[PDB]
Amino acid sequence: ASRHGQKGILSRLWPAEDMPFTESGMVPDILFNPHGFPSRMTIGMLIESMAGKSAALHGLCHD
Amino acid sequence: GGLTCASAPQGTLRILEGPQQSLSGSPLQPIPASPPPQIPPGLRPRFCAFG
Numbered sequence: 226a227s228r229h230g231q232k233g234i235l236s237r238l239w240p241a242e243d244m245p246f247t248e249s250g251m252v253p254d255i256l257f258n259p260h261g262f263p264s265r266m267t268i269g270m271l272i273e274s275m276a277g278k279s280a281a282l283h284g285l286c287h288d
Numbered sequence: 289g290g291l292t293c294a295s296a297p298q299g300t301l302r303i304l305e306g307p308q309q310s311l312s313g314s315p316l317q318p319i320p321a322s323p324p325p326q327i328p329p330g331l332r333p334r335f336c337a338f339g
Contacts, residue, residue, distance in 0.1 A: 283328065
């Protein structure tokens with residue numbers, strides 16, 4: 226689960242070479258279907274993703 | 289030589305002790321409002337591409 230009520234079971238363990246790699250070499254470790262947003266309207270997860278990426282990038286800690 | 293009823297009182301006084309109101313200044317908060325989260329100055333990119 227996330228901190229926004231988006232609970233779900235673990236359905237697969239996707240091999241690390243079959244995951245979509247980014248142009249920076251990275252590779253996600255969680256894949257989250259984008260269809261839980263439209264009906265549940267948890268816009269706080271889409272802001273937490275950006276806040277946490279900015280934190281990890283700048284060494285900061287946002288509130 | 290006994291006690292008899294006398295004339296009815298003509299008025300009543302009720303005493304109470306009361307202090308007064310000061311000026312309205314309405315000093316809401318030490319550091320007031322919700323101060324906004326903001327940009328650290330300069331920052332700089334902490335990541336580069338390969339090549």
